[PDB]
Design a protein around this motif. Sequence first.
Motif, PDB file in Angstrom:
ATOM      1  N   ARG A 167     -99.461 -10.476  18.404  1.00  0.00           N
ATOM      2  CA  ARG A 167    -100.355 -11.503  17.572  1.00  0.00           C
ATOM      3  C   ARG A 167    -100.457 -12.568  18.490  1.00  0.00           C
ATOM      4  O   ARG A 167     -99.427 -13.307  19.168  1.00  0.00           O
ATOM      5  CB  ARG A 167     -99.835 -11.672  16.105  1.00  0.00           C
ATOM      6  CG  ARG A 167    -100.226 -10.779  15.025  1.00  0.00           C
ATOM      7  CD  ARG A 167     -99.375 -10.846  13.757  1.00  0.00           C
ATOM      8  NE  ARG A 167     -97.951 -10.252  13.934  1.00  0.00           N
ATOM      9  CZ  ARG A 167     -97.300 -10.126  13.129  1.00  0.00           C
ATOM     10  NH1 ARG A 167     -97.343 -10.804  11.783  1.00  0.00           N
ATOM     11  NH2 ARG A 167     -95.925  -9.714  13.282  1.00  0.00           N
ATOM     12  N   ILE A 168    -101.673 -13.241  18.615  1.00  0.00           N
ATOM     13  CA  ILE A 168    -101.824 -14.505  19.469  1.00  0.00           C
ATOM     14  C   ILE A 168    -102.654 -15.346  18.758  1.00  0.00           C
ATOM     15  O   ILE A 168    -103.673 -15.164  17.713  1.00  0.00           O
ATOM     16  CB  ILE A 168    -102.709 -13.904  20.630  1.00  0.00           C
ATOM     17  CG1 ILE A 168    -103.161 -15.153  21.510  1.00  0.00           C
ATOM     18  CG2 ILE A 168    -104.195 -13.094  20.180  1.00  0.00           C
ATOM     19  CD1 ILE A 168    -102.180 -15.446  22.173  1.00  0.00           C
ATOM     20  N   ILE A 169    -102.151 -16.840  18.791  1.00  0.00           N
ATOM     21  CA  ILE A 169    -102.772 -17.993  18.302  1.00  0.00           C
ATOM     22  C   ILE A 169    -103.237 -18.750  19.609  1.00  0.00           C
ATOM     23  O   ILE A 169    -102.310 -19.126  20.591  1.00  0.00           O
ATOM     24  CB  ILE A 169    -101.726 -18.808  17.383  1.00  0.00           C
ATOM     25  CG1 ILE A 169    -101.371 -18.153  16.128  1.00  0.00           C
ATOM     26  CG2 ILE A 169    -102.415 -20.333  17.298  1.00  0.00           C
ATOM     27  CD1 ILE A 169    -100.415 -18.991  15.345  1.00  0.00           C
ATOM     28  N   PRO A 170    -104.566 -18.857  19.608  1.00  0.00           N
ATOM     29  CA  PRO A 170    -105.009 -19.781  20.894  1.00  0.00           C
ATOM     30  C   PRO A 170    -105.067 -21.173  20.716  1.00  0.00           C
ATOM     31  O   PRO A 170    -105.452 -21.621  19.640  1.00  0.00           O
ATOM     32  CB  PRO A 170    -106.476 -19.181  21.146  1.00  0.00           C
ATOM     33  CG  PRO A 170    -106.775 -17.975  20.244  1.00  0.00           C
ATOM     34  CD  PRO A 170    -105.610 -18.256  19.181  1.00  0.00           C
ATOM     35  N   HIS A 171    -104.444 -21.910  21.623  1.00  0.00           N
ATOM     36  CA  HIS A 171    -104.266 -23.365  21.739  1.00  0.00           C
ATOM     37  C   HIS A 171    -103.912 -23.731  22.985  1.00  0.00           C
ATOM     38  O   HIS A 171    -102.946 -23.380  23.465  1.00  0.00           O
ATOM     39  CB  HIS A 171    -103.121 -23.967  20.444  1.00  0.00           C
ATOM     40  CG  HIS A 171    -103.202 -25.293  20.156  1.00  0.00           C
ATOM     41  ND1 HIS A 171    -102.217 -26.009  20.532  1.00  0.00           N
ATOM     42  CD2 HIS A 171    -104.238 -26.013  19.287  1.00  0.00           C
ATOM     43  CE1 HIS A 171    -102.688 -27.246  20.240  1.00  0.00           C
ATOM     44  NE2 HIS A 171    -103.653 -27.384  19.482  1.00  0.00           N
ATOM     45  N   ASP A 172    -104.447 -25.015  23.334  1.00  0.00           N
ATOM     46  CA  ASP A 172    -104.197 -25.556  24.595  1.00  0.00           C
ATOM     47  C   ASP A 172    -103.208 -26.583  24.637  1.00  0.00           C
ATOM     48  O   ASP A 172    -103.403 -27.525  24.433  1.00  0.00           O
ATOM     49  CB  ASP A 172    -105.518 -25.983  25.090  1.00  0.00           C
ATOM     50  CG  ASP A 172    -105.452 -27.058  26.535  1.00  0.00           C
ATOM     51  OD1 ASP A 172    -105.256 -26.296  27.595  1.00  0.00           O
ATOM     52  OD2 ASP A 172    -105.335 -28.310  26.537  1.00  0.00           O
ATOM     53  N   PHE A 173    -102.010 -26.183  24.941  1.00  0.00           N
ATOM     54  CA  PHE A 173    -100.919 -27.052  25.032  1.00  0.00           C
ATOM     55  C   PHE A 173    -100.949 -27.914  26.282  1.00  0.00           C
ATOM     56  O   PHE A 173    -100.573 -28.879  25.953  1.00  0.00           O
ATOM     57  CB  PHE A 173     -99.364 -26.036  24.809  1.00  0.00           C
ATOM     58  CG  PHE A 173     -99.176 -25.351  23.651  1.00  0.00           C
ATOM     59  CD1 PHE A 173     -99.183 -26.231  22.351  1.00  0.00           C
ATOM     60  CD2 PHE A 173     -99.451 -24.042  23.525  1.00  0.00           C
ATOM     61  CE1 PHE A 173     -98.775 -25.565  21.308  1.00  0.00           C
ATOM     62  CE2 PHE A 173     -99.244 -23.292  22.140  1.00  0.00           C
ATOM     63  CZ  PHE A 173     -98.562 -24.351  21.157  1.00  0.00           C
ATOM     64  N   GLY A 174    -101.126 -27.296  27.218  1.00  0.00           N
ATOM     65  CA  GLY A 174    -101.354 -28.319  28.371  1.00  0.00           C
ATOM     66  C   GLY A 174    -100.096 -28.566  29.075  1.00  0.00           C
ATOM     67  O   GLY A 174     -99.626 -29.822  29.216  1.00  0.00           O
ATOM     68  N   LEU A 175     -99.353 -27.557  29.870  1.00  0.00           N
ATOM     69  CA  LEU A 175     -98.121 -27.919  30.579  1.00  0.00           C
ATOM     70  C   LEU A 175     -96.916 -28.388  29.786  1.00  0.00           C
ATOM     71  O   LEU A 175     -96.619 -29.454  30.315  1.00  0.00           O
ATOM     72  CB  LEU A 175     -98.495 -28.633  32.090  1.00  0.00           C
ATOM     73  CG  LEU A 175     -99.447 -28.039  32.889  1.00  0.00           C
ATOM     74  CD1 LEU A 175     -99.268 -28.906  34.536  1.00  0.00           C
ATOM     75  CD2 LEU A 175     -99.277 -26.382  33.021  1.00  0.00           C
ATOM     76  N   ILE A 176     -96.523 -27.537  28.962  1.00  0.00           N
ATOM     77  CA  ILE A 176     -95.469 -28.100  28.215  1.00  0.00           C
ATOM     78  C   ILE A 176     -93.974 -28.389  29.106  1.00  0.00           C
ATOM     79  O   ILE A 176     -94.017 -27.760  30.181  1.00  0.00           O
ATOM     80  CB  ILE A 176     -95.035 -26.981  27.094  1.00  0.00           C
ATOM     81  CG1 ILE A 176     -94.466 -25.849  27.609  1.00  0.00           C
ATOM     82  CG2 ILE A 176     -96.338 -26.776  26.489  1.00  0.00           C
ATOM     83  CD1 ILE A 176     -93.742 -25.068  26.558  1.00  0.00           C
ATOM     84  N   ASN A 177     -93.370 -28.936  28.298  1.00  0.00           N
ATOM     85  CA  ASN A 177     -91.788 -29.090  28.906  1.00  0.00           C
ATOM     86  C   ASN A 177     -90.765 -28.439  27.996  1.00  0.00           C
ATOM     87  O   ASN A 177     -89.928 -27.884  28.468  1.00  0.00           O
ATOM     88  CB  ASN A 177     -91.474 -30.766  29.135  1.00  0.00           C
ATOM     89  CG  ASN A 177     -92.130 -31.153  30.384  1.00  0.00           C
ATOM     90  OD1 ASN A 177     -92.725 -30.408  30.998  1.00  0.00           O
ATOM     91  ND2 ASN A 177     -92.106 -32.435  30.328  1.00  0.00           N
TER      92      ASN A 177
ATOM     93  N   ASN B  99    -100.867  -8.073   8.625  1.00  0.00           N
ATOM     94  CA  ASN B  99    -102.067  -7.350   9.023  1.00  0.00           C
ATOM     95  C   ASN B  99    -103.353  -7.939   9.515  1.00  0.00           C
ATOM     96  O   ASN B  99    -104.395  -7.617   9.204  1.00  0.00           O
ATOM     97  CB  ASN B  99    -102.318  -6.309   7.667  1.00  0.00           C
ATOM     98  CG  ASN B  99    -103.045  -5.055   8.092  1.00  0.00           C
ATOM     99  OD1 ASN B  99    -103.025  -4.472   9.181  1.00  0.00           O
ATOM    100  ND2 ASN B  99    -103.736  -4.331   7.246  1.00  0.00           N
ATOM    101  N   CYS B 100    -102.873  -8.928  10.070  1.00  0.00           N
ATOM    102  CA  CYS B 100    -104.027  -9.786  10.997  1.00  0.00           C
ATOM    103  C   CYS B 100    -103.714 -10.007  12.366  1.00  0.00           C
ATOM    104  O   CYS B 100    -102.309 -10.170  12.714  1.00  0.00           O
ATOM    105  CB  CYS B 100    -104.237 -10.872  10.124  1.00  0.00           C
ATOM    106  SG  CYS B 100    -105.819 -11.880  10.551  1.00  0.00           S
ATOM    107  N   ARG B 101    -104.787  -9.722  13.261  1.00  0.00           N
ATOM    108  CA  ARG B 101    -104.494  -9.768  14.731  1.00  0.00           C
ATOM    109  C   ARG B 101    -104.297 -11.090  15.302  1.00  0.00           C
ATOM    110  O   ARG B 101    -104.168 -11.094  16.294  1.00  0.00           O
ATOM    111  CB  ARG B 101    -105.476  -8.692  15.486  1.00  0.00           C
ATOM    112  CG  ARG B 101    -105.074  -8.389  16.742  1.00  0.00           C
ATOM    113  CD  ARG B 101    -106.094  -7.488  17.592  1.00  0.00           C
ATOM    114  NE  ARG B 101    -105.791  -6.113  16.705  1.00  0.00           N
ATOM    115  CZ  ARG B 101    -106.746  -5.177  16.935  1.00  0.00           C
ATOM    116  NH1 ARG B 101    -107.895  -5.176  17.805  1.00  0.00           N
ATOM    117  NH2 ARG B 101    -106.333  -3.758  16.502  1.00  0.00           N
ATOM    118  N   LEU B 102    -104.738 -12.183  14.610  1.00  0.00           N
ATOM    119  CA  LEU B 102    -104.936 -13.632  14.859  1.00  0.00           C
ATOM    120  C   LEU B 102    -104.030 -14.646  14.228  1.00  0.00           C
ATOM    121  O   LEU B 102    -103.490 -13.687  13.136  1.00  0.00           O
ATOM    122  CB  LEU B 102    -106.364 -14.022  14.911  1.00  0.00           C
ATOM    123  CG  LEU B 102    -107.365 -13.624  16.052  1.00  0.00           C
ATOM    124  CD1 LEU B 102    -108.502 -14.447  16.101  1.00  0.00           C
ATOM    125  CD2 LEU B 102    -106.569 -13.581  17.352  1.00  0.00           C
ATOM    126  N   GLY B 103    -104.304 -15.786  14.260  1.00  0.00           N
ATOM    127  CA  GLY B 103    -103.349 -16.598  13.389  1.00  0.00           C
ATOM    128  C   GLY B 103    -103.978 -17.925  13.370  1.00  0.00           C
ATOM    129  O   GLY B 103    -105.086 -17.993  13.467  1.00  0.00           O
TER     130      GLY B 103
END
Lengths: 199, 508, 114
Positions: free
Chosen positions: B426-436, B478-482
């Motif tokens: 399962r995948i949640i798309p979000h641009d975190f941007g070079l985390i620490n 039963n859901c492929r996204l988040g």
Amino acid sequence: YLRPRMQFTGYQISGYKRYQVTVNLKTVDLPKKDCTSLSPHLSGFLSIRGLTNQHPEISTYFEAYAVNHKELGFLSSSWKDEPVLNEFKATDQTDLEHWINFPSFRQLFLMISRIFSQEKQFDNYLNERFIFMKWKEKFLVPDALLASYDGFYYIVHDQVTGNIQGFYYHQDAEKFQQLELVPSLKNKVESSDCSFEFA
Amino acid sequence: TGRIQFAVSTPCNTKGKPSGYRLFEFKNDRLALVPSERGCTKVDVNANIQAFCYLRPNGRDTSISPTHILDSCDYMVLAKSNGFIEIISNYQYKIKNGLRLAPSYILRCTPEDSDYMIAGLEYSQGLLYCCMCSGRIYVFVMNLPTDYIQYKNMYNPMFPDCFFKVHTHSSEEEKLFEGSTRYTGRSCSKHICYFLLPIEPYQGLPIYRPSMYLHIERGISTFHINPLDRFCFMTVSPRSPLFIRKIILPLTYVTFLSTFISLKNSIEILSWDNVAQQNGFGSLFSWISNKFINSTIWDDIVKYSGTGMLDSGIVWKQRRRNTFMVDFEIVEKIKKMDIVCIDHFVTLSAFRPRYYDEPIIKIDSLSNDETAQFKQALGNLCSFKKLFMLDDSLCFILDTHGVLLINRFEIKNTKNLLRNSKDTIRIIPHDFGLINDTIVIINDIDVGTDNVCALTFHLVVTSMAGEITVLKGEFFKNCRLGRIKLCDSLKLNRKDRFVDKLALIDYD
Amino acid sequence: DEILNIMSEILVETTTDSSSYGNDSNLKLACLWVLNNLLWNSSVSHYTQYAGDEFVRTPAAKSNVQVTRATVERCRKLVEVGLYDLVRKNITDESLSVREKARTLLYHMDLLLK
């Protein structure tokens, strides 16, 4: 993401320490179907500052050439013997290692003489999502007269998300230093455009 | 949902400026900076907080205020960049009552050469390991009860047994080590630094020496302690294999430590030279030789004043394309251990070290209407950053372009992910941007039949942009996204300060 | 109304319709940038994302309802004019930059409409 005024921010792992790296582009001149000219494709200022230690900022002017599979191939053997292009060349084996580290290179070649023969039938490089290129620091930006940049960067740039990864190579140095840049978000979503043109 | 207390390390860049940490609060739906008076602003000049470690009892609650045989206090140890470790007791009481966060105990890495980089600072079963990226490890023996544990950057409302935390093969040296070094009891001069030896002469606080010192000729980047064996540790460097190594304990050091503990219990002793001069010996080593072996080990002990030089031995090594392994963790499969590793150029691996050397599970090149969105989300992954283990099976990976939940047992088709089940990836798309860093707090967990879970969680992400962001997310069933959303964010408007790794203090 | 007509005549150009302007990607990028600037501001970002002093809040985390309904009305006017189908036709465009810019703009307009 390769506009003239575009800023990139990230880190760099050198030895075991971490540094903060900022890149400001100046001129972007990306060729097309025919290119027998040695004018640089990309140009900018690269500044490295300390993050773990108190190392002072070192900022340099750099130029860069893209990899189109007509004249400037992946391996530094199709690159012509010129005094300006002789600083981007190391070895075909070293080039193959530093390029096989990236997964997009492998996904390109699965869709020494064999890879060049397969490279000869590639499509236009500007219509592909990933752009491979080499970066080389030329001199110091604040005052040129007033050298630890003898290597060069293997750079992969992703256009859709617009981010930059790469390695730094020099013979008498440590190997495989990572870059991992990202675009710098601004404080205003509305953007306005300036322009210039060399006469 | 509840308040979250944590601490964020802020290092500086320009010389002659303090580099420290700040305490932050997430209350209701707002971030807040807690006004606290930390230590004096001369210790943090040209020395930034490199590592945090929080020690607290596992089952029993923490103490309220500073006559009990069983200890119940709360400890914070801070690892600097100049080789100094600071131990502060009663952290939460001082935070709540607005007291001064001054260090109580000082620890030094004495066999050295202000540019020391901490590869790791961890605690296990009364042993504190502090390892340096040059490849040198210092081991301290602490006087703590068995139920004390290290508080990680993770909260789980249910407590699984997939980590060897809640409790034959030991040799004689290990038996005398665990017999001679036991928790005595809280009294006068019976603090946490009881089994340590001070430097004979940070204000007037005594400074202590490590109990053991090791140097390996590889250089390490990530380091973990084996939860099964106290004297076993495993290390990873970039472009090098996983190594599992074991401490070799000679009988000389164990006999010296046991006799020294008996001698100290027989008698605050700040200088043993003064006691030896009062006892007519001139040195502690002459006294313990009279009260009493290998010649070289004893010479090493008396040369470095208590610290024992030890040698390690490799017991496991894993077996061209290089590896850039970012993180790993040890999981009990429900020697029955598995090692799960995430590698930078999106790669997931799982090893069983007892049976095989090669990885038993390997997912490589993970980026190579709902299915279209799933393919687009998988195509945007660039570089794995963080790994957590929810359970013995679930893997919670945080990329820079999203969040992944992966069930490593129900995967059955490598290089073609569409033929697997719906809830295995399962995948949640979000641009975190070079985390620490990041703090996962699982708010609502719900497991169901055939082992399928749905959860709602929180995230605490620091970035290279100088932002501290608290986010809320949910993975369905039963859901492929988040689905993710932003709760709060704070921006650091300094051109020299950075927002480094952070440690979780408390969550209701 | 004339500027929207000019934008619609620029965006409709394709490989076979390169007569009025010549299918130049720079004019298409400029038109998409105008359409992006008409629909992007801080209040919309806060609505569609969220649920000195050394530590300040971002402008997207900090009146917004009126600006939001004004932007939604602008989006509805742009839909009624007929630039939405042109944005889809520019999803199906040859050059990559126009493709990605039109994809981002179409996703933003789709999320504003609902």
